[PDB]
Ligand binder design. Structure first.
Ligand SMILES: *[C@@H]1O[C@H](CO)[C@@H](O[C@@H]2O[C@H](CO)[C@@H](O[C@@H]3O[C@H](CO)[C@@H](O)[C@H](O[C@H]4O[C@H](CO)[C@@H](O)[C@H](O)[C@@H]4O)[C@@H]3O)[C@H](O)[C@H]2NC(C)=O)[C@H](O)[C@H]1NC(C)=O
Ligand SMILES: *[C@@H]1O[C@H](CO)[C@@H](O[C@@H]2O[C@H](CO)[C@@H](O[C@@H]3O[C@H](CO)[C@@H](O)[C@H](O)[C@@H]3O)[C@H](O)[C@H]2NC(C)=O)[C@H](O)[C@H]1NC(C)=O
Ligand SMILES: *[C@@H]1O[C@H](CO)[C@@H](O[C@@H]2O[C@H](CO)[C@@H](O[C@@H]3O[C@H](CO)[C@@H](O)[C@H](O)[C@@H]3O)[C@H](O)[C@H]2NC(C)=O)[C@H](O)[C@H]1NC(C)=O
Ligand SMILES: *[C@@H]1O[C@H](CO)[C@@H](O[C@@H]2O[C@H](CO)[C@@H](O)[C@H](O)[C@H]2NC(C)=O)[C@H](O)[C@H]1NC(C)=O
Ligand SMILES: *[C@@H]1O[C@H](CO)[C@@H](O[C@@H]2O[C@H](CO)[C@@H](O)[C@H](O)[C@H]2NC(C)=O)[C@H](O)[C@H]1NC(C)=O
Ligand SMILES: *[C@@H]1O[C@H](CO)[C@@H](O[C@@H]2O[C@H](CO)[C@@H](O)[C@H](O)[C@H]2NC(C)=O)[C@H](O)[C@H]1NC(C)=O
Ligand SMILES: CCCCC/C=C/C/C=C/CCCCCCCC(=O)O
Ligand SMILES: *[C@@H]1O[C@H](CO)[C@@H](O)[C@H](O)[C@H]1NC(C)=O
Ligand SMILES: *[C@@H]1O[C@H](CO)[C@@H](O)[C@H](O)[C@H]1NC(C)=O
Ligand SMILES: *[C@@H]1O[C@H](CO)[C@@H](O)[C@H](O)[C@H]1NC(C)=O
Ligand SMILES: *[C@@H]1O[C@H](CO)[C@@H](O)[C@H](O)[C@H]1NC(C)=O
Lengths: 443, 170, 344, 49
């Protein structure tokens, strides 16, 4: 996998292509988007280093979440008296639900994609469960109306979690399942009403149901074995999720790998994914904190869920690199400037062990082609102790020009200090004066 | 594309219906308006830079060409004499004619020349000598003239001043 | 009298990918479909950066001869010691420029270039470090301060040797009191009034230059056009970084949390709301920088014309080289600017 | 002879919240997540003034 720059013909045939990760000149060509470069100094993007391996680390737990207890075992309640349970410390491998008799007919999720459920870790999970009828199943969703969504069970508008429903004709076709049908006003999200007081349609109370304007507030579903498909009993489970800066309690089935340090890698810490370099840290966290973020919302620290140590993350290309060229119509030689970097730590900044062979030439001293200026460390040029007039500005009083070479072990681009002008030998005098004798007419 | 399914508006109106096409046309309109905005605001900024140079050229044409200027580096390097304008594509080219001194020689000087007690200082110029002979000359071209009563101003006594020399003040 | 004029501002550079998408191949792939907004946002910033060196070159480097004069010399009663570089003392600057360089609070000289490290030694969180981690870099000027201060020493020692002849041709030596008598003839006054009261003109002059020191070393202000140049660059570079923390209406401000919970089709509607806000922030930054550069260029041109008409000449323009009738002017280097001393 | 030259412009001020969101709590609470786009839009107009 690599990226290339390609040039087409006016009739539509491929006539040229370059690989951008090969050498500094190719990097400059790919950054500029041209096959020929003029003279000067340019700033390039990063096409040198790409990550190779993957670091994934998850908690130590192995026990599977209780899917049997909440799906095949519990006896289920009515909708007005709905029940809630908490799930903690388990691995959420839901493939074990394929061998069961649930036979889900409605599986629909908000604030979650089904295909990422295996790569996520949650700070908290709640499960609500109850029984409704077939025509009432579509009312269990945020932002709905009806009798169930107004008087029995209401979801908040900013819900995050999944909803499951399935038919239970052969086990729940009996009497004793009720729902509320009369009430003064609507209920608020995640609220319960278990009262069984007589209802008066004028606005007050009563003392006995059945007389004028007084009714029972609860109605029986009346499930029988010969009902239509819309009058059958259905079991419903709603799962609510939380994702915060807190210890993970429910995690998916992923395999952990080894900690690889001081290399540009892809990482996954408890579902927090990224790319960069991982090193040791001297930062301090609060006891229930999992990562740290800076002023630009860049995650700079994270703790290991296995060894409990705090590590730091740095980007794979942090400083700017510049390339100096005299023109592609003249030579293919280039020089490289590493801004604000000392020549002793160039190898550990470029990640020498992860770049192409041609790139390691620009990171080792060899025969005096590496030298230090006040703008950074410059590689690929030979320093001259005499001063000229500036041609290509490198910076901090240093310029560069082209030279045809003879002595081998000597580079073809010359770096020097800029000259301010020629000295004058006019001396002060207190009794003499110089006066011109002729003149010149200039245009 | 700006995120939409294509950059061709007639491939969105051929495959999608009135409701879900206006969600994809808007994302082209927004980008295509942003490009025009960028072009216009970079053109306004460049017009301001061209106007300053045009004003400088208009000033230089009235001062350097329809007159002789005494500001030093305004009509070339030297003492300005004349200028000629020539037309160039989208611009103008000035040819400046200037006077440049050359072939200097050194002389010995004095601030004033003393005669009969009174002191004589130069009206405009310097006092020079060849050796036992004193003249007054201009600073831009060597032309020694004899000391006399209209190129010399008399005022004071032959003391106080430092460097004063004594000679005939015809 | 003093006059302060700014000449240049700091040079900055931006990496589009690192600022908008960070290290995220997905985001990168999508940015390609918004076109050349990013090879167009770099050319403008590069032009602004290459203009700032020409600004300095048009003000300081107009004489290509280095003249040298000893500062302890007599000159007929004029001291010239607080304006010409010290002879022995290590400093290559003068006693006034050394005081000017201690009254502007430059903003960071470069961590990894000043014994700094954005790794471990990032302190609580150095502003500079957050900038480099996000694609914003500052480039150094081409002319060094020790090398700018060399042009000003050759420009003051050229008027103590030749007057204003070095600005129309070769330098022609003249005694200093004879040069000051030519300048009195230029404002309408005869040559004798200088030769007869030389010792009091050489004392008023000496006392006036000895009082600019203790009018700058106490008062903190009046170098207030050079400090704003630094402050506006700092508060504008820091406002761009703190804007990568906004969600612009999506589920989060982090892109690795939209791609860890949504699938290829629905993540793209949320990663377009962020790619659109972060492009607008950058566009705003560069359109404000382009406008500021145009205001700096007018002052640079005015400084360049004052260096030619007030220092390499005597001007007859009324309020151009001070308040009164003009005799001489001296340049002194100041950070990002220039200070003119006018004698009247 | 006469010569005319302008020297000054009328100085104006804008309210970000009033112009964008009118009087509305929900719009105001939604405008806080767009950053400092009008804290920065005020300093420019103040300097011009
Ligand atoms: C939390 O508890 C409080 C306290 O119990 C509760 O407040 C009550 O809310 C109800 C509903 O709004 C109020 O009841 C109304 O009172 C008027 C009095 O005139 C009646 O007219 C109303 O009945 C009308 O609407 C009926 C249709 O549903 C019609 O059939 C009828 O003819 C009337 O038009 C109704 O009974 C009650 O007064 C307050 N009690 C107070 C304020 O003390 C609150 O609603 C509860 N919140 C939740 C969400 O459970
Ligand atoms: C699909 O569903 C069936 C039925 O629930 C699962 O069969 C059950 O599998 C477990 C695990 O192997 C069996 O546990 C075993 O029990 C025996 C004693 O009965 C014990 O000696 C073993 O060590 C182990 O504990 C369980 O008995 C078995 N039950 C039946 C009725 O077969 C099956 O495992 C499920 N699918 C898969 C592939 O897991
Ligand atoms: C509180 O707890 C009591 C006891 O569990 C609940 O009482 C039960 O209420 C139901 C009605 O909701 C009664 O069913 C009815 O019984 C009568 C005969 O008694 C019958 O004629 C009706 O058709 C219906 O079947 C049930 O008998 C009754 N049981 C007892 C022991 O009282 C009460 O409902 C609970 N209150 C709530 C809802 O919190
Ligand atoms: C997660 O499991 C690993 C492997 O069992 C634990 O690592 C061991 O921890 C003990 C106690 O610190 C050390 O003596 C062993 O040398 C470790 N083994 C290895 C291979 O590293 C680890 O402590 C567990 N983490 C938690 C949070 O319980
Ligand atoms: C200094 O200048 C004077 C005036 O020009 C010179 O004197 C004249 O010299 C010429 C040539 O010898 C004679 O013909 C004249 O009769 C001289 N007249 C006067 C007024 O002196 C003098 O020779 C010059 N001296 C030197 C050293 O060149
Ligand atoms: C020129 O000015 C300097 C500075 O005023 C004179 O030297 C001394 O400088 C120190 C500070 O560097 C002052 O504390 C002394 O009071 C100064 N002494 C005197 C006598 O002023 C210097 O003497 C002056 N003279 C020259 C060299 O012309
Ligand atoms: C009782 C333990 C509950 C644990 C819940 C935690 C896990 C997070 C998500 C998984 C639950 C949904 C599983 C859906 C299975 C496929 C449904 C279908 O066939 O369409
Ligand atoms: C297209 O142009 C290329 C380059 O000239 C040529 O080699 C090729 O044969 C051309 N093909 C056609 C069909 O024109
Ligand atoms: C000036 O120089 C020219 C060229 O050397 C020479 O021909 C001419 O005679 C000289 N004139 C003077 C005034 O010396
Ligand atoms: C000129 O300098 C010399 C040597 O220092 C000295 O003897 C002479 O007096 C000085 N003359 C004037 C006028 O300064
Ligand atoms: C770079 O080298 C200089 C001189 O030794 C030193 O002062 C500075 O701290 C070094 N910085 C780095 C990058 O380590």
């Amino acid at each position: 996998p690599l990226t290339m720059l390609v040039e087409f013909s006016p009739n539509g045939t491929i006539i040229d292509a370059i690989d951008c990760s090969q050498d500094p000149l190719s990097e400059l060509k790919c950054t500029t988007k041209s096959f020929s470069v003029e003279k000067g100094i340019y700033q390039t993007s990063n096409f040198r280093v790409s990550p190779s391996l993957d670091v994934v680390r998850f908690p130590n737990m192995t026990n599977i979440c209780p899917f049997d207890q909440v799906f095949n075992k519990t006896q289920f309640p009515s909708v007005y008296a709905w029940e809630r349970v908490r799930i903690s410390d388990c691995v959420s491998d839901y493939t074990v639900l394929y061998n069961s008799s649930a036979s889900f007919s409605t599986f629909k999720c908000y604030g979650v994609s089904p295909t990422k459920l295996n790569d996520l870790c949650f700070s908290g999970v709640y499960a609500d469960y109850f029984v409704v009828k077939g025509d009432h199943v579509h009312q269990i969703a945020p932002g709905q109306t009806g009798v169930i969504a107004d008087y029995n069970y209401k979801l908040p508008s900013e819900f995050v979690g999944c909803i499951l429903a399935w038919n239970t004709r052969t086990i729940d076709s009996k009497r004793g399942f009720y729902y509320r049908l009369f009430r003064h006003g609507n209920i608020r999200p995640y609220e319960r009403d278990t009262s069984n007081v007589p209802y008066n349609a004028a606005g007050g109370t009563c003392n006995q149901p059945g007389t004028h304007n007084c009714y029972e507030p609860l109605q029986d579903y009346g499930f029988t074995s010969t009902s239509g498909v819309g009058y059958q009993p259905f079991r419903v489970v709603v799962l609510s999720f939380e994702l915060l800066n807190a210890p993970a309690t429910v995690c998916g089935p992923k395999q952990s790998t080894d900690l690889v340090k001081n290399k540009c890698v892809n990482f996954n810490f408890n579902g927090l994914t990224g790319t960069g370099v991982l090193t040791d840290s001297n930062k301090k966290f609060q006891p229930f904190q999992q990562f740290g973020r800076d002023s630009a919302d860049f995650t700079d620290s994270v703790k290991d869920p296995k060894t409990l140590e705090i590590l730091d993350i740095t980007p794979c290309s942090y400083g700017g690199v510049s390339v100096i060229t005299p023109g592609t119509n003249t030579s293919d030689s280039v020089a490289v400037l590493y801004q604000d970097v000392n020549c002793t730590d160039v190898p550990t900044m470029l990640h020498m062990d992860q770049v192409s062979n041609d790139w390691r030439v620009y990171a080792v001293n060899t025969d005096g082609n590496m030298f230090q200026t006040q703008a950074g460390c410059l590689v690929g040029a030979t320093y001259d102790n005499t001063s000229y007039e500036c041609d290509i500005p490198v910076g901090a009083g240093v310029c560069a020009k082209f030279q045809t070479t003879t002595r081998a072990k000597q580079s073809s681009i010359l770096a020097y200090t800029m000259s301010l002008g020629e000295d004058s030998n006019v001396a002060y005098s207190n009794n003499s004066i110089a006066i011109p004798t002729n003149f010149t007419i200039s245009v | 594309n700006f995120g939409a399914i294509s950059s061709v508006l007639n491939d969105i109106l051929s495959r999608l219906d009135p409701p879900e096409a206006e969600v994809q046309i808007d994302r082209l309109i927004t980008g295509r308006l942003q490009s025009l905005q960028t072009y216009v605001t970079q053109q306004l900024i460049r017009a301001a830079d061209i106007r300053a140079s045009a004003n400088l050229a208009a000033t230089k044409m009235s001062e350097c060409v329809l007159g002789q200027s005494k500001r030093v580096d305004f009509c070339g390097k030297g003492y300005h004499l004349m200028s000629f304008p020539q037309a160039a594509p989208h611009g103008v080219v000035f040819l400046h004619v200037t006077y440049v001194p050359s072939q200097d020689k050194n002389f010995t000087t004095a601030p004033a020349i003393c005669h009969k007690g009174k002191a004589y200082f130069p009206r405009e110029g310097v006092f020079v000598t060849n050796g036992t002979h004193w003249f007054v000359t201009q600073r831009n071209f060597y032309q020694p003239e004899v000391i006399t009563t209209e190129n010399t101003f008399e005022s004071g006594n032959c003391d106080v001043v430092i460097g004063i020399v004594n000679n005939t003040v015809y | 009298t003093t006059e302060v004029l700014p000449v240049s501002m700091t040079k900055t550079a931006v990496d589009c990918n690192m600022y908008i998408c960070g290290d995220s191949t997905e985001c990168s792939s999508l940015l390609l479909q918004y076109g050349s907004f990013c090879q167009q946002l770099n050319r403008a910033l590069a032009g602004v950066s290459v203009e700032q060196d020409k600004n300095t070159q048009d003000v300081f480097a107009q004489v290509k001869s280095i003249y040298k004069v000893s500062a302890i010399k007599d000159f007929g009663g004029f001291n010239f010691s607080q304006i010409l570089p010290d002879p022995a003392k290590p400093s290559k600057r003068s006693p006034i420029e050394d005081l000017l360089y201690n009254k502007v609070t430059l903003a960071d000289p470069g961590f990894m270039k000043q014994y700094g490290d954005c790794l471990g030694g990032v302190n609580a969180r150095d502003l500079i470090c957050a900038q480099k981690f996000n694609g914003l870099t500052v480039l150094p000027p081409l002319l060094t301060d020790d090398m700018i201060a060399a042009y000003t020493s050759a420009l003051v020692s050229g008027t103590a040797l030749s007057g204003f002849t070095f600005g129309a041709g070769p330098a022609l030596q003249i005694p200093f009191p004879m040069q000051m008598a030519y300048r009195f003839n230029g404002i309408g006054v005869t040559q004798n009034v200088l030769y007869e009261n030389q010792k009091q003109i050489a004392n008023q002059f000496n006392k006036a230059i000895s009082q600019i020191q203790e009018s700058l070393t106490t008062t903190p202000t009046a170098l207030g056009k050079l400090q704003d140049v630094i402050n506006q660059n700092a508060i504008a570079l820091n406002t761009l970084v703190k804007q990568l923390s906004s969600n612009f209406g999506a589920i989060s401000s982090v892109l690795n949390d939209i791609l860890s919970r949504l699938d290829p089709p629905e993540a793209e509607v949320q990663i377009d709301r962020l790619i659109t806000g972060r492009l607008q922030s950058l566009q705003t930054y560069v359109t404000q920088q382009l406008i500021r550069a145009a205001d700096i260029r007018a002052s640079a041109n005015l400084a360049a014309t004052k260096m030619s008409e007030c220092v390499l000449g005597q001007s007859k323009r009324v309020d151009f080289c001070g308040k009164g009738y003009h005799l001489m002017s001296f340049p002194q280097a100041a950070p990002h600017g220039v200070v003119f001393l006018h004698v009247t």
